[PDB]
Amino acid sequence: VALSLKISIGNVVKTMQFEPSTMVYDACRMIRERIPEALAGPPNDFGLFLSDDDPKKGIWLEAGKALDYYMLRNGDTMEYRKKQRPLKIRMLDGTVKTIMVDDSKTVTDMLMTICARIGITNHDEYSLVRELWLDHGRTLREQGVEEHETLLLRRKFFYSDQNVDSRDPVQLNLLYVQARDDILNGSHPVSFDKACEFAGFQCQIQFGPHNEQKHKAGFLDLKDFLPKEYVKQKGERKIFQAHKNCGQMSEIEAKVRYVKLARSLKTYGVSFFLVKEKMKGKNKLVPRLLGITKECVMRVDEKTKEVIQEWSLTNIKRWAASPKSFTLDFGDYQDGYYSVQTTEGEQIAQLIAGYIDI
């Protein structure tokens, strides 16, 4: 009724007899009394390990369990193996530190050990991330992480303001979809540079961190990532440099950065109309974007989205629509009406009237 188990240590294999109820912690002691190789380091740096052809499936025995918890049988082998191994962690400043960690611990337990060595007490404001997602309640080993891999130390993201809250993913996703769709469909006009910035975050959100082997030329369908007017361009390299610049940023940080970026623009929350300006004495017309808000009218370059002129709504003296044009009269504020060619004049006139009313 004794269990006869082969103990492997280095190149030694010695069969020892154990009662099936022997606690692992006592079994380790027993081994340390009999094989000098077992004394290579302190007891807490070693344990018993059952290997598997799949390295992911080898398991460390728990000190406080009995051997028979593990269903051990006569002729099985247990390895008395060092738990401590060196793990490369990327710090926040980009440098890489090599820290001794216990292979039998969960990611969470290691992270606590890691933080304490570098002087961080709030270990739960951090997570570890892999270099090509880790459950922090499982071990690195069982998740297929190989010992030569570097992990990154990443601070959990928190941001909130009057507009967005990183703690409420549902609401955040509503605001992100709205801002993104308005940008993709041209409702919110943006420069090419800003479109490509937005699309970098979009890539981060849809694909995760940039992967140079997979996220290569011709990977994106640019019609899904840029306003139409920018598809006829070399946008992909610009988008991927923005994507890359996101590093290991979480999906929620990326959404928050997208929404804040959209709200920072002069053009955000403005109702836009695509109109044309007549050029005196010439046939050409010049496209322009005309924007209206509760506080102002803006004249915006159709290409660059620069605001080239702006007026307060309180400066309008009168305004007039016809079936082909729309005209603003600013009276003594400036010399000359602003008139534009458009078939949407009634609708512009109506938006203005509504704002002036209040």
Residue numbers in the entry: 2 to 133, 173 to 398
What's the publication's text?
The FERM domain protein talin (∼270 kDa) plays a key role in activation of the integrin family of cell adhesion receptors and also provides a direct link between the cytoplasmic tail of the β-integrin subunit and the actin cytoskeleton. Talin consists of a ∼50 kDa N-terminal head and an elongated 220 kDa rod composed of amphipathic helical bundles. The integrin binding site is located in the F3 domain and, although a second integrin binding site exists within the talin rod (Gingras et al., 2009), only constructs containing the F3 domain are able to activate integrins (Calderwood et al., 2002).
We also established that the talin head contains an additional globular domain F0 at the N terminus that is closely associated with the F1 domain (Goult et al., 2010). Based on these results, we extended the FERM domain construct to include F0 (residues 1–400) and removed the unstructured F1 loop (residues 139–168), as illustrated in Figure 1A. Overall, the model contains 358 residues and 561 solvent molecules with an average B factor of 18 Å2 (overall) and 25 Å2, respectively. One molecule was observed within the asymmetric unit and is shown in Figure 1B. The structure of TH′ consists of four domains arranged in a novel linear configuration. Both F0 and F1 domains have ubiquitin-like folds, the F2 domain contains a core 4-helix bundle equivalent to that found in acyl-CoA-binding protein, and the F3 domain has a phosphotyrosine binding domain (PTB) fold. The F1-F2 linker region in talin (residues 196–208) adopts a distinctly different β-hairpin-like conformation in the F198-S205 region. The packing of the linker region against F2 positions the F1 domain on the opposite surface of F2 relative to F3.
